[PDB]
Design a protein around this nucleic acid. Sequence first.
RNA 1: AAAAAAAAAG
RNA 2: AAAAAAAAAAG
RNA 3: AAAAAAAAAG
RNA 4: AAAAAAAAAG
Lengths: 72, 74, 72, 75
Amino acid sequence: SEKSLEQCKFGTHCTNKRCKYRHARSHIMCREGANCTRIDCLFGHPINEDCRFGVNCKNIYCLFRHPPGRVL
Amino acid sequence: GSEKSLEQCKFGTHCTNKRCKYRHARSHIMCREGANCTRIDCLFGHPINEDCRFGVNCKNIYCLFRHPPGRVLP
Amino acid sequence: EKSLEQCKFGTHCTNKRCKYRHARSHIMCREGANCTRIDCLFGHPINEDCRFGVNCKNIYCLFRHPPGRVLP
Amino acid sequence: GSEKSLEQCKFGTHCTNKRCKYRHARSHIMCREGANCTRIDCLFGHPINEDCRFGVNCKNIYCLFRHPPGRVLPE
RNA sequence: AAAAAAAAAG
RNA sequence: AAAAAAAAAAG
RNA sequence: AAAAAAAAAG
RNA sequence: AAAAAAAAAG
Ligand SMILES: [Zn+2]
Ligand SMILES: [Zn+2]
Ligand SMILES: [Zn+2]
Ligand SMILES: [Zn+2]
Ligand SMILES: [Zn+2]
Ligand SMILES: [Zn+2]
Ligand SMILES: [Zn+2]
Ligand SMILES: [Zn+2]
Ligand SMILES: [Zn+2]
Ligand SMILES: [Zn+2]
Ligand SMILES: [Zn+2]
Ligand SMILES: [Zn+2]
Ligand SMILES: [Zn+2]
Ligand SMILES: [Zn+2]
């Protein structure tokens, strides 16, 4: 078994039974962000990939990277 | 003929029933026509006919399940 | 919490809280339907009639078939 | 031509990529034309261009992955 | 080769 | 209570 | 980074 | 309301 701190982009809808990444079960973003070192942490951490839906992405819980100028 | 229903699919974009009869939301925006929307292929959110497991204290602002009165969101 | 009842989706089950038994081998369990090992990975019968009936040709199918279906 | 490919999807009926460009088998029967089949919506099984994880010892008679020579199956 | 690249209000 | 996070640590 | 390379009989 | 009751060879 392998375990990484990198965030799984599929979250609770991941269906890879050998997935080595972290999975969020809360819409709350972890208070430590990308600095969190808890392997089984259930809060959200940033995904290192640009959001397909850009500055106009309407999902306030989205963990992908957005341009500046997007207001929550 | 068609067996499709206006009732909302509780799994949304994560439904993997290849024969699902229900409506699927692909937007986080709630449909402006509400539960009265009659467009079978409408992609906006509509209420699900099932009680939310998380009850009056559910804090997911996109949740489409049914909640008791007095639920408060930020 | 866990049940001896066979999961009808096997390795393709995506219920993260599933309480049923999952076959990871196409070999049928030598103890049959009355096997009581909770983590047994061999096949046991599903409690549902096969949609494909007496003419089902999938030799690994665990659903229920009428007696006229004979496997080579 | 179109974006669709004749290459076989390795996930079959359990594929959940809504943008998948590959061919999907809905039968355990292997296509009589094999890897030479050019029908883009063919539902029968064709060889996958990837080595089987279970190698010469694979006993799944419906497996579409590549195997070493010397694999045997029940007769 | 698994995000809603389906846009109608994204 | 057979596919939602009734898994809680801040929900 | 989505096959059962998880084995007890594969 | 998650099996290929979608068929061309099932
Ligand atoms: Zn994952
Ligand atoms: Zn954390
Ligand atoms: Zn986004
Ligand atoms: Zn559905
Ligand atoms: Zn609508
Ligand atoms: Zn709710
Ligand atoms: Zn299951
Ligand atoms: Zn057993
Ligand atoms: Zn069958
Ligand atoms: Zn072209
Ligand atoms: Zn595919
Ligand atoms: Zn073919
Ligand atoms: Zn194989
Ligand atoms: Zn990565």
